[PDB]
DNA sequence: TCATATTATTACGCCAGACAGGG
DNA sequence: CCCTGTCTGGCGTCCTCTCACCTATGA
RNA sequence: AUGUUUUUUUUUUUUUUGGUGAGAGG
């Protein structure tokens, strides 16, 4: 099985799972620890922001690849803003501070 | 873009500021059409239009007026994702307190209003009343009231009196709670009391009272008044395949809260009576509490069928919340997965990758390449071209592959060598071809395994895959110094068959002018691959400074050793191939090649090793047959001699001469002896079976048996497995844990019958159950370790210290187990090591000890090295580059940046699978004696007896290093003395552990002081001997009239005056303990070394109990202060022990549980770190008593003992840094001139920078005290709540952070993996240097 | 079809952490 | 009042693949 | 040498841009 780009889920902006659903590989927790074990800071940054979740990042990246410019414009993951709204939907005021 | 994440409470004004419209109706959707509800949960005006830039109902179907809201639609006009960020709010009719601040353990409202949880819930569920500023009545403010208590009060205090209930009353209490006022009171209460329990109970209440005043969190924000609703997009309502909507659980929760709130508003309209609106508000309280955190209240609500439905807190917490399932691990585009296979033609920087996966993973690069050439125009055309797969896109694909690495990943990645980057080579096929040597890194066999491929998209990621994660760059395991590209199984058989010899072959003893014609004689058919031969080889030894000097000579060698010499690079000597080359020898061949010639010859030489091993293993034809497993001819007579022996033992058992346990022990002993004899018979019969003549009489050699080369080469097989295929397969054990007395005398070449196979299945089912349940604890151990580490980044170059732990070789009592060169390899010395002669600067004080320095250490026989350890590093927030050590997979020091906490945590937890889950001293060598911790005396006979319990007996050799060590008890008969030379095997120690000696220092006469027969001691004349002994009783058997009497022996002179201790003016009286029996009676003159009484008496969960720092059930008790010791009160729960120091203050004591067999007498002076009883010892006692270096030596020795018992090589840096992360918190003792509190627990770097910026001023600092937290308590007690929330319980940590108003200055690895940016360790450390500089 | 709103099983194994009881 | 059983909560491995099954009521 | 010397309607518009549970592999 292989996946470059196709459909994703509803709640989250990450790719679907499985083969019958044309989906990508779950880059799990211990693989993130293995990339932290190296100096792979940029590989991990595209591994969890551009390739997976951030919608503006992935559309800009697809257009940047097909122009011939391997460069990522990262932004913030969508599932973290989902986390902010689920935490904030309690009596909890979680924010994002100064520039 | 943004610094720290701030968490605080949500005010009702803040919740109305989040909101966009009140969600009234609970009606979800229409359900018969497609439209929602106006205005229900899924509204239009409150949130937004379903369709993008459209009024859902009807107006604006173009792009001109985005925003207009007509009365017929009551709809906003924006994007489809606008509803995902917009949230609604439910105006709760009746106030409802939060469940996270009422049941968090400890509750936030429980230790703030000074009221028990039980009483808080009673009033909260409309079952109890609470008073609130009554007035001039006889009632308190916190005191509650019941129906009867209120009824009577109602008729009594009908006027000025307030007694409400529920959240409303609670809210008022919190609202009317002067925070500041309580502070002073609490502070004054803590300074006006001495109660230990109260002190801790008051310090925990004042801590959460002053923390609330420090932030902008109000006391009335605990109760929920304006409940917030999560965005619809985040609670999606999609239908499955069919005609119904599979609705989420949160819609059930919100719809019930809104149904109940509408009912409560209608009842407060209608003026229903009291009990109706109490049940109505109570059902609303339980509905809100079920929405927020379901199931924390009594049994959780359920929709379909009996399974409870999932609430908001269950969208956060757990293994499947947002942290562990969508933020730490994500699903990933440009990724693939398939079954692996070998492909041995590969070079070790490249892997095979199928054409179909390659054309799917590289669709955008192919699109960009196709658009560059000009073959097509629009993007559609290119997608049709690769959907059709024409003849021109495969050249495009070979031009996008070429220099573009991919990340191969095996699915259980345990350490960092399980993600490696290759270059693709395209494969006709559907299976990833993976280079074989690399398999030993992935733990990948080829029995059905699968791997995932990931594509580095951007340019920095291609460079990270080539420069950090390439497979040529990972040739040493980061856990140690051992190479991980060791040749595994076929190739060592090909080498072991190639470089060997036989006593006659084709071309025996002919002479050859080079290795080239050695291979030419092997190929043409004129010699054999193993035929001993003088060749002329030219080995290049590089003895100058970087210059290779040729020396050519004639080596008496074989043909195969010359053929393998054609592949060895220049610098290695010929003697690396002159031996037989098993697996350990080829591993040290690649290791010496890496240490001498560097990286590139070692990569190309690893490939040439693998190619020549595969080729000559193919030419070998090394099969396995049924005749290869040679049965010993002596096996049947050994079994019959064992059968005669068990027959003799059972004939004694019929006549009852021996006991049953001694029978079972004798049967297990003779079957162990017969098993060892059968193994030696088959091992001789395999290791030297070949006996071939050469030009005359016969001559023997090691065998070319196939199973023996598979065992001796170390390819696959050991002694035990080849033992079970030929000799008997031992004594298998039943699942009771005890062994079975009748062994399995049949191997596998003979047939096992039925019972023997069933006993075998006992033994093997236990092993499969152990692995399949062991793996969960191994993985959870790696998780706890990488979440306690998680932060620690090499961030300096020198901390500027002179402290470091004292690396000695470790010695258990056998031969010296782990040499000093294994422990001080590549670790930077603390002070400069003196050469063992006299005062020489052998090595300087900041040199890395690589192999050349360690060889000059081994030549001089250096005792022990004071070396720098990670736990002694002075760097605030990180570890400096010298106190870590060598890079371990790079030859140099650790770079500024490389995350060492994560590689250390992986290197400790990765061998978690291989670990298991469930008289006197006899010297061995011949050397010199030395004693430490010794205070001794010469007895009458001459044997130096010892008056100290804790004496260490070292055996030092003639060179200076310490070769043996032992522990000698109080009062033992030493055959030798101090500084003496002995012989190998001579007994040097003797004692009796069943009889605790009460030996003396001086001589004289014996008097019975406080020894009265009848109450103190008893008369027990011996039965079978007649020589009686006055038996000393204990303090429990005698009655209360004489229980105060302490029996003792004090030595006098010939007159009767007390003979004093030499050095003091005190007599030497020995107080006899309980259960003693007097050996030497009254009037008998004594000497030293003679007793005065007879006193009769682990694998992987050990690693968990060392890092998590549990206490053992019966710890060894110690002394918190030095000085004289005494006893106390007679058995009220415990038996007291009072320690009065010589110069220090007296009042320390401890109540010992009296079930322990003590070690100390009444006239004994103790010390800190000195034992009082025996058994295991908790690490907190080591930390608060001996020192920090003592507890780090304790953990690294007690866990390298597990990792060495199971045989795993791990360097000690990793355990020292997880020990650093254990003892990172501290507690204050004297607050000093700072802003801390008395017994406040604060982290160590904070208090150290505080009193280091105050001590640089005039003010003297604050004196701390370090504390050792276990790894899950230490990773949950962090100054970064996302780090402590991605890990275990999120409810406790988020309420603690919310009511404290905590802020997360990100500054670690997992905060930046959550929030989606660069890691502040690796390549991103320059980015975080830049961002930290530009503030 | 369109609002009404929650009851008659037990059978893990530590391991911390808080709580009423009593010498 | 300091030990103490006793009770309550909170953990318990990653990755993947196949299949089936989904609230009752109701004038 | 010369040409108002057989006229009649044989008619003008695009394209537009998803949970639950069970089982297997490693
Ligand atoms: Zn409209
Ligand atoms: Zn340091």
Curated annotation (Swiss-Prot), chain A:
Native species: Escherichia coli O157:H7
Shown segment, full-protein numbering: 1244 to 1342 of 1342
Protein name: DNA-directed RNA polymerase subunit beta
Quaternary structure, from the entry: The RNAP catalytic core consists of 2 alpha, 1 beta, 1 beta' and 1 omega subunit. When a sigma factor is associated with the core the holoenzyme is formed, which can initiate transcription.
Family, similarity comment: Belongs to the RNA polymerase beta chain family.
Coiled coil: none
Gene: rpoB
Function of the protein: DNA-dependent RNA polymerase catalyzes the transcription of DNA into RNA using the four ribonucleoside triphosphates as substrates.
